[PDB]
Design a protein around this ligand. Sequence first.
Ligand code: TJI
Ligand code: TJI
Ligand code: CL
Ligand code: CL
Ligand code: CL
Ligand code: CL
Ligand code: CL
Ligand code: CL
Ligand code: MG
Ligand code: MG
Lengths: 8, 8, 232, 232
Amino acid sequence: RSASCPSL
Amino acid sequence: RSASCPSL
Amino acid sequence: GAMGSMERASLIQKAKLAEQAERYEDMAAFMKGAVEKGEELSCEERNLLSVAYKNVVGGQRAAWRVLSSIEQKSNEEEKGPEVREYREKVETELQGVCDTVLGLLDSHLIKEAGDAESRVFYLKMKGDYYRYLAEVATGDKKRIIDSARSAYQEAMDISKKEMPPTNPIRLGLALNFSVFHYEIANSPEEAISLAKTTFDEAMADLHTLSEDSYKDSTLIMQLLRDNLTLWT
Amino acid sequence: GAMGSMERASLIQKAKLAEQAERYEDMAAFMKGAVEKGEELSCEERNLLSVAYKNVVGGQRAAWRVLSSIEQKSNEEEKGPEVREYREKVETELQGVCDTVLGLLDSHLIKEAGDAESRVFYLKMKGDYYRYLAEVATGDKKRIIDSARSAYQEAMDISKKEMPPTNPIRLGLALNFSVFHYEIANSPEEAISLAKTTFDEAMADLHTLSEDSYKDSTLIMQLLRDNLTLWT
Ligand SMILES: *C[C@@H](C*)C(=O)OCC
Ligand SMILES: *C[C@@H](C*)C(=O)OCC
Ligand SMILES: [Cl-]
Ligand SMILES: [Cl-]
Ligand SMILES: [Cl-]
Ligand SMILES: [Cl-]
Ligand SMILES: [Cl-]
Ligand SMILES: [Cl-]
Ligand SMILES: [Mg+2]
Ligand SMILES: [Mg+2]
């Protein structure tokens, strides 16, 4: 799975 | 801290 | 609301405490409370709002994926309605949290946002929360997908005019929009092209940054590169 | 109840799904539902009950400690009532979960438990939930401490008569009772003596076990030894 922008 | 019995 | 009797500054203080205790659900309720006071949010406040809800929704999305996967495996021995019921339960809660965030954006965070920083921030948030709705949508998926695209594109237009290419939110917006293209809109080529051009334009602007700004931009740039390595 | 309309077997199935999705709060509500059907729990069901609530309460205990520590640091610049208010909020929820578990044990899990396995299990649970109340008690701490001790001692008496020394629940009971002595009752010597004698008696009974039983006992034995290394 692609990584989205993490919390932060 | 002391370890208690973990969940399992 | 339940937070209607608490001071704005007290809600913000409690949100920071909830963050330290990893009580993200409490953190989210405090920040909803803060937003409903009707004053514009500072940069630090927007960040708290964002962290609270991303963590709450993050937990629900992960559970949902675990359950969908068990459900799909069962549609290859008959086990009754329980898997579908529970998946629907988690899904419904997920949709309520997304509906809460989008309601806040619509009443009245977005329309009061005049500065590029705040406006981009709120439009990106809107894109992300429609994207999360899209991940679980089956029967309306098309309108949801288009609402996501439209919020992301509007944010991209402002970020391109008003912000330098290394600005962390401009970068994080592009990363999330590229994930939208790849995972939701079925456009891997659009995804790869956006990630590459975003990375290249930031690279060429690193020289303008202080060491601290430099560290913030390059962290997001690494995630763009990680996805490009996955997608290619 | 809210679970009163769902089948017992459906609640158990959903509890297992909630466990896989790490939705411990849902898992706890399903298992409460299952218990309130009024039938005795099997071994696997008791385990689900135990995992659900230990995880829910585990999260609250960790938040509480984070907050108490901030609160104590503030009683060494004046910041207002927020830290105390929030600590009290988390504390109150923690006490409600413990009160829920102890209510279930009292209506009617313990009194229906005839076999040593079930009875020890339920009494240990009772000890642990009073121990968690004791961790946060200030003004009644003494009665709470004594209710914990009394449940643990009753379980220890049955476990010593009815179970082999390597039985995982006998071992886990002794470990938790030793932590009670060390962290709650202020009796580090009692703690060390119980841990040592428990470890030694299990060691001498390992030879009777299959390879699988052997692996289960030795895991708990390592935690006894880890505490002994900390306490000595
Ligand atoms: C991760 C979020 C979308 C963002 O842009 O953060 C800036 C560091
Ligand atoms: C951890 C719990 C108290 C217990 O005894 O588990 C048996 C493995
Ligand atoms: Cl939470
Ligand atoms: Cl359900
Ligand atoms: Cl829009
Ligand atoms: Cl949970
Ligand atoms: Cl509070
Ligand atoms: Cl008792
Ligand atoms: Mg078959
Ligand atoms: Mg001072």
